[PDB]
Every structure is written in structure tokens, then in C-alpha cells.
Amino acid sequence: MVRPHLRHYCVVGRETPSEKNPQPTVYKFEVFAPNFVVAKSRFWRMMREKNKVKSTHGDVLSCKVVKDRKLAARNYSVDIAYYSQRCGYTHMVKEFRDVCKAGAVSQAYNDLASRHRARYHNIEVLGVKSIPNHEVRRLNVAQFHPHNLSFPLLQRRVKAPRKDRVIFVKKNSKRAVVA
Amino acid sequence: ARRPARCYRFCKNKPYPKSRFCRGVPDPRIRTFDIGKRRAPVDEFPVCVHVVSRELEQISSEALEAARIQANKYMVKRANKECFHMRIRAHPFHVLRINKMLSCAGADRLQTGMRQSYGKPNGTCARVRIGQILLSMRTKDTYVPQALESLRRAKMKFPGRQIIVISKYWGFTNILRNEYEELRDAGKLQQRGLHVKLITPKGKITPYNIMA
Amino acid sequence: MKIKSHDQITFPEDVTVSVKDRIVTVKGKRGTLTKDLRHLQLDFRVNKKLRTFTAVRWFGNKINNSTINTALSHVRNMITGVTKGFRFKVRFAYAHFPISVTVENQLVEIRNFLGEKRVRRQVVADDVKVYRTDAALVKDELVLEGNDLEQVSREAAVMHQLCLVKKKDIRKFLDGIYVQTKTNIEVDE
Amino acid sequence: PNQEITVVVRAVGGEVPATASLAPKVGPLGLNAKKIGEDIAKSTKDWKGLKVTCQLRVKNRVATVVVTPSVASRLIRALKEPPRDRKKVKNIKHDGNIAFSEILKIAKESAPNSMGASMKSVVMEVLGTAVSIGCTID
Amino acid sequence: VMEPTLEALAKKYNWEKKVCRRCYARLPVRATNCRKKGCGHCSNLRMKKKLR
RNA sequence: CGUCAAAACUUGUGGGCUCAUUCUCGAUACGUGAAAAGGGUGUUGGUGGAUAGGGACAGUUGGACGGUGGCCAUGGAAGUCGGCAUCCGCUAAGGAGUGUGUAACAACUCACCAACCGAAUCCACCGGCCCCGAAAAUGGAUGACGCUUAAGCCCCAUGUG
Numbered sequence: 001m002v003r004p005h006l007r008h009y010c011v012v013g014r015e016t017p018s019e020k021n022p023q024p025t026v027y028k029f030e031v032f033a034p035n036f037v038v039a040k041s042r043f044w045r046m047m048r049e050k051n052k053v054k055s056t057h058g059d060v061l062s063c064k065v066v067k068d069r070k071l072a073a074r075n076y077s078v079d080i081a082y083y084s085q086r087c088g089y090t091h092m093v094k095e096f097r098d099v100c101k102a103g104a105v106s107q108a109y110n111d112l113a114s115r116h117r118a119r120y121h122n123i124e125v126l127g128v129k130s131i132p133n134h135e136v137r138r139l140n141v142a143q144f145h146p147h148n149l150s151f152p153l154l155q156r157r158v159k160a161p162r163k164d165r166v167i168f169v170k171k172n173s174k175r176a177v178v179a
Numbered sequence: 180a181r182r183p184a185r186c187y188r189f190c191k192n193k194p195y196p197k198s199r200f201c202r203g204v205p206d207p208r209i210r211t212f213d214i215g216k217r218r219a220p221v222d223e224f225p226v227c228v229h230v231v232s233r234e235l236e237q238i239s240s241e242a243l244e245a246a247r248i249q250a251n252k253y254m255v256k257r258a259n260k261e262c263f264h265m266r267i268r269a270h271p272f273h274v275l276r277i278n279k280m281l282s283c284a285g286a287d288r289l290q291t292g293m294r295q296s297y298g299k300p301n302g303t304c305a306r307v308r309i310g311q312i313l314l315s316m317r318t319k320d321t322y323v324p325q326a327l328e329s330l331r332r333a334k335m336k337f338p339g340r341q342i343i344v345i346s347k348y349w350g351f352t353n354i355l356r357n358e359y360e361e362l363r364d365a366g367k368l369q370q371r372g373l374h375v376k377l378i379t380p381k382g383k384i385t386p387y388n389i390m391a
Numbered sequence: 392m393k394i395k396s397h398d399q400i401t402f403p404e405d406v407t408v409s410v411k412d413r414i415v416t417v418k419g420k421r422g423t424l425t426k427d428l429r430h431l432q433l434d435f436r437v438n439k440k441l442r443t444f445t446a447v448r449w450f451g452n453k454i455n456n457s458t459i460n461t462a463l464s465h466v467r468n469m470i471t472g473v474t475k476g477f478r479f480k481v482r483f484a485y486a487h488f489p490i491s492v493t494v495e496n497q498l499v500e501i502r503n504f505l506g507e508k509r510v511r512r513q514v515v516a517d518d519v520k521v522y523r524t525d526a527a528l529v530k531d532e533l534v535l536e537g538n539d540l541e542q543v544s545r546e547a548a549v550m551h552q553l554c555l556v557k558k559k560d561i562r563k564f565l566d567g568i569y570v571q572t573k574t575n576i577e578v579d580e
Numbered sequence: 581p582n583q584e585i586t587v588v589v590r591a592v593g594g595e596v597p598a599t600a601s602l603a604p605k606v607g608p609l610g611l612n613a614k615k616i617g618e619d620i621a622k623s624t625k626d627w628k629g630l631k632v633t634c635q636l637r638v639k640n641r642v643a644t645v646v647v648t649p650s651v652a653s654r655l656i657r658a659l660k661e662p663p664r665d666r667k668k669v670k671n672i673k674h675d676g677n678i679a680f681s682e683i684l685k686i687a688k689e690s691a692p693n694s695m696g697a698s699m700k701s702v703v704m705e706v707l708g709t710a711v712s713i714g715c716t717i718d
Numbered sequence: 719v720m721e722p723t724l725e726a727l728a729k730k731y732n733w734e735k736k737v738c739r740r741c742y743a744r745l746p747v748r749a750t751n752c753r754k755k756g757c758g759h760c761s762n763l764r765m766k767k768k769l770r
Numbered sequence: 771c772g773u774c775a776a777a778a779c780u781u782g783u784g785g786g787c788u789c790a791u792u793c794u795c796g797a798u799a800c801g802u803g804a805a806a807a808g809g810g811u812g813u814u815g816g817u818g819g820a821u822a823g824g825g826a827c828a829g830u831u832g833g834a835c836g837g838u839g840g841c842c843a844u845g846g847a848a849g850u851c852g853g854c855a856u857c858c859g860c861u862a863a864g865g866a867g868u869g870u871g872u873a874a875c876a877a878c879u880c881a882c883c884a885a886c887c888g889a890a891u892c893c894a895c896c897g898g899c900c901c902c903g904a905a906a907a908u909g910g911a912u913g914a915c916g917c918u919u920a921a922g923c924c925c926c927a928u929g930u931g
Contacts, residue, residue: 001784001785002929002930002931003783003784003785003926003927003928003929004929004930004931005784005926005927005929085897085898087897090816090817090896090897091816091817092815092816092817092897093816093817094815094816106785106926107785107786107925107926109925109926110785110786110924110925110926111785111786111787111815111925112815112898112925113785113786113787113924113925113926114785114786114787114788114814114899114923114924114925115786115787115814115815115898115899115924115925116814116815116816116897116898116899117787117898117899117923117924118898118924143450151394151449152396152398152434152449153394153396154396154397155397155919156392156919157781157919158781159778159779159780159781159782160779160781161779162778162779162781163778164781164782167779185806338807392919393786452813453813453814454813482724484720484721484724484727484728485720486719486720561732561733561769562732562769562770564732565720565724565725565728565731565732566720567731569724569727569728569731571727581836581837581838581839581848581849581866582838582848583848583875583876583877584875584876585875585876586872586874586875586876587875588846588874588875631844631845631846631874633846633848633874633875635848635875648839648848648875649839649848650839650844650848651839651841651842651843651844651848652842652843652844668844668845669845670843670844670845671842671843671844694837694840694857694858695837695838695840695857695858695859695866696837696840696856696857696858696859697857697858700856700857700858701840701856701857701858702840702857704840704856704857705840705841705856705857706840708841708842708854708855709840709841709842740902740903750811751810751811752810754902755791755792755901755902756792756902756903756904757810757902757903758809758810758901758902758903759809759810759811759812759901759902760809760810760902760903761809761810
């Protein structure tokens with residue numbers, strides 16, 4: 001992939017300034033959020049629920065962007081919770097192998113949107129992980145896992161008119177599909 | 180047709196129950212909320228299924244009775260009398276108002292104006308909320324599919340959205356069924372009537388035990 | 392979009408096939424039989440030039456996967472006609488009312504039904520060939536044969552449909568001229 | 581098991597039972613006589629009535645007619661005289677001084693030599709067949 | 719009787735289908751979900767009524 | 771920001787789903803027929819079970835026999851209109867018998883398994899998009915066209931690599 005849509009930030013935060021909490025105890029996520037404004041919102045938000053704590057009372061120390069390994073595909077497993085359908089939290093497990101976890105989160109979200117129709121708030125993406133065995137579950141990832149996986153493919157595009165030459169006036173020459 | 184239940188999909192108004200204020204009270208049919216064995220120690224039905232409402236709805240008695248009897252019918256007919264104890268877990272009572280206009284004091288049209296039009300007793304319904312186990316049925320595990328099938332008539336005797344859930348809870352009773360058995364085994368479980376009682380960690384004065 | 396892809400063909404042995412275009416041209420014992428297929432093009436790859444041809448797909452959609460088979464089989468059957476041909480047997484069947492069918496050759500004439508009503512006539516399309524055969528206790532019998540089952544069949548099925556009846560109950564209705572054996576002309580090589 | 585034709589009915593209490601099964605004097609095999617003739621008249625002095633649908637057994641070399649283990653039948657086959665049956669309609673029966681042959685007789689008697697285990701098969705098997713003819717006689 | 723074999727053949731023709739209720743559909747033995755679109759392949763299928 | 775109609779006919783740099791003989795797939799918020807129930811092996815993606823290579827699953831193939839009615843009602847069912855029934859043997863397995871029905875026997879069948887078989891398959895759930903459900907009066911209107919490797923629906927992006 002990598003249309004790097006979505007961003008990844010790690011947030012590290014703390015409970016009460018108050019000595020009523022003398023000594024707060026500290027929170028981490030690396031979270032895919034498209035900006036930090038959100039990120040911290042989200043961070044806080046489970047804190048406002050799961051942990052019941054209002055942001056306006058407590059304190060995030062940090063929110064810092066978090067980078068992927070390197071240059072190549074690792075097999076990601078994805079775990080999902082979506083709340084919609086006017087019927088709340090529901091789970092799913094899905095599978096992507098790519099080079100970026102981010103691209104995976106990203107791709108999920110469209111995928112859900114297209115694919116389960118969904119919308120983004122309503123998802124809490126639980127997790128993405130590089131899968132080590134030769135599995136790697138899902139049939140489509142396994143499908144294209146093959147050593148010596150290779151292919152044929154045909155029949156599409158390039159923009160026919162254009163400013164990079166050239167709209168309506170075409171063709172100067174003759175036709176088929178071309179390949 | 181009938182001042183139909185479809186039409187009463189809203190609520191608008193207050194809760195309208197029976198009240199002193201009520202004196203127009205009509206009376207539906209719908210009677211026997213507990214079916215099967217009503218002295219089924221909890222052990223009798225280990226198993227528990229709820230027939231839940233999905234939400235927010237309003238429901239007529241007519242439907243309610245109809246499923247009841249249906250419930251019993253298929254069930255018993257297939258499966259025996261007690262093999263569950265099918266329990267209507269919902270009592271409902273909310274009182275309906277009628278127009279039913281034109282009480283014949285004049286000619287015809289513009290008969291009323293509105294003239295304290297104001298609702299006559301029409302029926303009972305619950306204007307329901309919060310995914311109520313409607314009927315709860317407690318079984319014995321074996322009798323589960325039979326349990327389900329009645330519900331298939333039963334759902335049909337409502338309209339609207341009602342869902343079918345089995346609970347870890349024992350038959351109208353409490354906890355994941357394995358832990359419940361275990362609960363008896365570990366003794367943390369105590370029998371009352373069909374209904375049953377559970378032990379406190381605050382600990383009071385004194386059931387004592389042995390020995391003399 | 393998700394890759395099926397498109398392409399061409401599977402194979403057996405002693406019969407030549409087109410291998411090109413939408414069109415399979417199958418040639419064997421009984422001549423050559425050929426068909427042009429529409430969207431039916433699909434992951435070919437020749438495995439032997441003369442000896443192995445398959446088309447058994449890489450990826451694509453659900454619907455796609457079915458076709459692949461349906462395609463082979465039919466062309467296989469193109470081979471079948473070209474090799475061992477088709478022979479359909481029909482027998483006229485009737486009890487209350489006797490029923491007669493002849494064959495003009497170029498056309499099939501059907502008489503008698505229910506005392507006869509209309510005369511059912513079917514022109515003999517190409518290579519469905521028609522024989523009324525009767526000795527050897529060949530019996531109220533038509534034989535349709537040639538090297539295209541689909542045609543031999545189509546004409547045949549057509550016949551079953553030519554002997555339809557309406558009004559006044561299937562529980563007394565039966566009689567008509569029914570398919571009695573759809574086969575090859577023979578076993579052949 | 582080991583099944584064979586419909587012999588149908590007894591038709592006469594003397595010799596030559598059945599509607600037309602034993603009417604031929606000699607069959608198509610030339611099978612010889614001993615257990616087919618007056619022996620089935622002699623048999624009638626020990627049993628009568630009910631569904632005598634019979635079976636025919638060609639196993640040795642003399643003609644042989646023998647009754648099925650038919651139900652109601654093989655039970656009333658224990659009696660020693662005729663009280664007068666009065667025709668079988670709705671599985672008829674009558675007293676004749678012989679009962680209680682299940683749980684203390686055949687069940688115990690056949691306990692060490694039967695299909696399956698001592699007290700699971702045989703004893704349990706026999707009981708039902710004349711369960712309501714029980715009377716604790718000595 | 720046009721011939722027993724024929725009757726057997728015939729029966730296949732004369733009796734052997736189950737039917738989509740909704741659209742009355744003459745359906746197979748093995749039918750599950752009807753072939754008429756507007757019936758949504760509906761699943762109450764009834765057996766052909768035996769003849770008398 | 772398709773064309774009517776200004777603006778990527780979005781491509782470099784982008785993703786799915788969705789195909790819709792409907793009077794006809796659908797498609798601007800508000801909006802307002804949001805058809806309803808209620809369905810559909812349309813497609814599309816779960817979850818729970820599985821069985822599963824010591825073989826699963828399909829498809830086959832062979833057998834589905836024997837100790838033995840183990841049985842009772844019963845006009846007549848020895849397994850078999852009906853009803854209480856039921857263990858051993860042989861085994862790979864075969865029911866004291868799955869049906870079909872000679873009034874009943876028979877016969878006919880396979881449930882039961884081996885052998886084949888050789889890989890997924892099997893069940894239930896799931897919920898998604900998609901369709902049936904789906905009838906009135908003037909010709910008719912997603913604005914119109916049309917659009918469907920969209921100009922739909924949904925998704926992201928206008929982005930390196």
C-alpha cells in the first residue's frame with residue numbers, strides 16, 4: 001500500500017494532578033489517529049469511560065508519532081470492534097499482510113465502510129500484528145503468500161483525454177485495447 | 180379495522196397506568212404469567228432462555244395472550260408440561276385511551292368540535308422500554324430446541340422487534356450454569372421455592388452448623 | 392476489480408480443438424464441430440502444444456469459478472460429438488389412442504394423437520438425423536442422431552415439448568412421445 | 581429372518597390345512613410324506629385357533645408343516661384342551677390353566693444359554709409377552 | 719398402459735415435482751428455493767398432490 | 771468540478787462493494803413511501819461448532835449379513851397400517867432394522883460401515899451490502915441526459931514512496 005492515510009501516535013498519559021492521587025500511574029497506546037488532536041481525544045475518551053476519568057481533570061504527558069519497522073511486508077492480523085447497526089459493539093477478525101500497519105488500519109476502515117457499510121467513530125480497531133507462521137490466516141493473504149506467486153492480469157486504463165496530452169481530439173492513429 | 184395496535188406506535192402522553200384517576204379501566208385477557216412448573220426448584224430447570232424485547236416498543240394484550248397460549252401449546256404438545264417453565268416475565272398494564280367519537284347527540288359532521296374528546300379506556304398495553312425479558316423460559320438443556328420452536332410461534336404473536344437469548348444464568352436463576360452447579364457444590368447456592376437464595380460476605384448473626 | 396482473467400482452454404487427446412479465439416474448433420472422427428463463446432474466456436495456458444491444455448484459473452470472483460467447468464464440459468462434448476456422436480432414442484407411447492410418427496427425413500411427421508388433432512411436424516435440422524426404426528422390435532420409435540447432442544437433444548427436447556397436452560388432468564394424462572435413450576451413436580474412438 | 585412364502589391361514593382343523601397350499605398329493609420335487617398329513621391333524625389335538633399364518637419348511641426330505649412363532653398364537657399354544665375360542669376379532673384370549681412361564685421359567689431356564697447377557701437380554705425379553713397373565717402360582 | 723416402462727418414464731413426467739407455493743412453481747425434487755424472481759425463490763414448497 | 775453547467779471525465783498518487791427482464795440498479799443534506807411485516811443459496815464480509823488427512827467432505831465401490839420376530843397391538847407386520855420394542859454375534863459395518871407396502875410374507879430400499887476416495891469440507895450461528903415482498907386512474911421524469919472498469923454506493927486521497 002502506502003497512500004499513508006491515517007497517522008500513528010503513541011500517547012502516554014497520567015491521572016490526577018491532585019495529591020489526592022499522589023502518584024498517578026500512567027497509560028500508553030500507540031494509536032492510529034489522523035492527528036493528534038484526535039489522538040488525545042481518543043486517549044482520553046477511554047479514560048473517560050473505561051476509566052471513567054474526565055480529560056479536563058487529568059493530564060497527558062505526551063502524544064508522539066510512532067514508526068513502523070522498515071521497508072517490507074510483515075503479516076498483519078487485525079481485530080475489530082464496531083458499535084453500530086444500532087446494536088452496538090460487535091467484533092471481527094480480519095487479516096492483512098503489508099509493510100505498514102497504518103495502511104492496514106486505514107484499509108480496514110474503508111473496508112468496513114464499504115464492506116460492512118460502517119462509519120469510523122463507531123469502530124474501535126483493536127489491534128494489528130505481524131504474523132509469523134507460514135500462517136498468516138485468511139485465504140486471501142494466504143492466496144498471495146505463494147513462493148513463486150506470480151500472475152497474468154489484463155484490461156484497463158490510463159487517462160484517455162488529459163492535460164498531459166490530450167483531450168477530445170484523439171485518436172491520431174488506430175485502436176484495440178493496447179498491450 | 181379496530182383501532183389498531185400499529186397505530187399506537189407512539190406514546191406521546193404520560194405513562195397512563197391504573198390509577199385512582201383511572202376508573203374507566205377495561206380488562207384484557209392475558210392471565211397466567213407462569214407456565215410450566217411453578218414449584219420447580221431452581222435445579223428443575225437448570226437452563227435459562229429469555230425472550231427479550233429488542234427495545235423501546237409498545238405492546239397489546241392481544242398479542243400477548245396469543246403467544247402465551249401458543250407457547251404452551253407447541254411446547255407442551257411437543258415436549259411435555261414441565262420441561263421448561265415458561266414464564267411470562269413481563270407484567271404490563273398501561274392503559275389506553277379512546278376516542279371512538281360521535282356519541283350521537285346531534286345531526287352528523289362537526290359533531291363534536293372536540294368537546295373534551297379526551298380518551299376513553301381502550302385497552303392495555305405496555306409502552307415498553309428496556310429490552311425486557313418478556314417471557315423467560317427455564318429449561319432443561321435437552322429441551323432447548325423445543326423451547327426455541329415455540330418462540331417461533333411466539334415472536335409471531337407480537338409484532339415489532341423481540342429477540343431470543345440464552346443465558347449463562349441458570350433457569351431464571353443465577354450465574355453461568357456450570358458455576359451454578361459448582362455453586363451448589365461449593366455450597367454457595369441455597370434453595371427457596373421454585374425461586375432461590377444466595378449467601379452474603381457481610382455475614383450476620385448466625386446460622387451456626389455442627390456439632391453438638 | 393479481482394482477478395479471474397481471460398484466456399482459453401482444457402483438453403484430452405485425439406481430437407483437435409481450436410485453442411484460439413472465443414471459438415473452439417473441434418475436429419475428430421466424426422468431423423469437426425466448433426463453438427464461439429462470448430464472455431467465456433478465462434485463464435488458459437497451454438501445457439502441451441498438442442498434448443495438454445487446461446484453463447483452471449487463478450483468483451477472481453465466485454461466479455467466475457463456476458463457469459470454468461461449464462465451459463470445459465461443453466467443449467468436451469464438442470469433442471464427444473466429433474468422436475462418438477449422439478444417438479437419441481424416442482418412443483411414442485400411448486395406450487388409449489394409438490400414435491404414429493414417420494420421418495420424411497428432412498422433417499419428421501407426427502400423427503394420431505388422441506385420434507390426432509394437428510399433425511406435429513418437425514423439420515429435421517442439420518445433423519439430427521431421424522429414423523423410424525421398427526424391426527428388432529424397434530418400437531414406436533424414433534431415433535435422432537448425429538454429432539451434436541445439443542442439437543440432437545434440442546430437437547429432442549423440443550419433441551417432448553411437441554407432445555404436450557392441456558386440459559382435463561395429468562392424472563389421466565401420459566401419452567405422448569418421450570425420450571427413451573440419449574446416448575452416443577455408439578462407443579467409438 | 582430366514583423368510584419364506586405366505587401360507588395365509590389354517591382353513592381346516594383336520595388334515596390338509598390351508599386354502600390350497602397342501603391340496604396337491606405330491607409336489608414338484610417328489611418330496612416324501614411324514615410330517616405333513618395326519619400329523620397336522622394330530623397337532624390340532626394340542627393346538628387350535630388364532631392367527632395360524634404358518635410357515636413351510638423344506639429343510640430335510642419329508643414334507644413338513646409347522647406353525648410360525650406368531651404372537652398371541654405361541655402363547656395360547658401352551659393350553660391342553662379347547663374351552664371354545666369363539667373366533668379371533670381384536671386379538672381374543674381365554675383361560676386354560678397355564679401361565680407364569682416367563683420370569684421364573686424361561687428367563688431362569690434360558691439364562692445361561694441365550695443371545696446376550698444373563699439378566700439384560702433373556703430375562704427382560706420374555707417378561708412382557710405374558711406380563712398381565714401373572715398370578716403367583718406354585 | 720402404454721407399457722410399464724413407459725409408465726415409469728411417464729410418472730417422472732406425470733407426478734414428479736414439488737412446487738413453490740407462492741408462485742405455484744413446478745419445482746424439483748431437490749428444490750429449495752424457487753426459480754421465479756418475483757417470488758424471491760421462496761421456500762414454502764409443497765409437494766405435488768397425489769393423484770387419486 | 772460527467773454533459774447539459776464553472777471546475778480533476780482525478781488519472782501518478784487511491785479502496786472496496788454493488789449488477790439490479792422492477793412502472794426501472796442506484797444516486798444532494800433538509801425531504802417527507804425511509805413501503806411494512808416478512809422473506810429470498812443474490813453477493814459480500816463474521817462468529818460459534820466442526821469433521822478433517824490415523825482421511826475429512828463430496829462423488830463413488832463393495833456389503834448393509836448373522837446369533838435372532840429377542841418384539842406386542844394384530845383382520846392381517848416375521849424389522850416394516852398401527853403400539854410397548856432390543857440384546858449378542860460377525861465385524862470394516864450393517865438398525866432385534868431408514869424408508870417402499872404382497873391385507874401379512876416376500877421382494878424393493880438405505881441408516882450402519884468398510885473399500886474407494888483424497889481435500890477440504892461439514893453444521894449452526896452472524897451481519898453486512900443486494901433482491902422478493904411491492905396494486906388506480908393524463909405522457910414523466912435520481913432536474914434532464916445519462917452514467918455502471920459509474921457520472922452508483924460506500925471509502926479515502928489528491929502524497930512521497
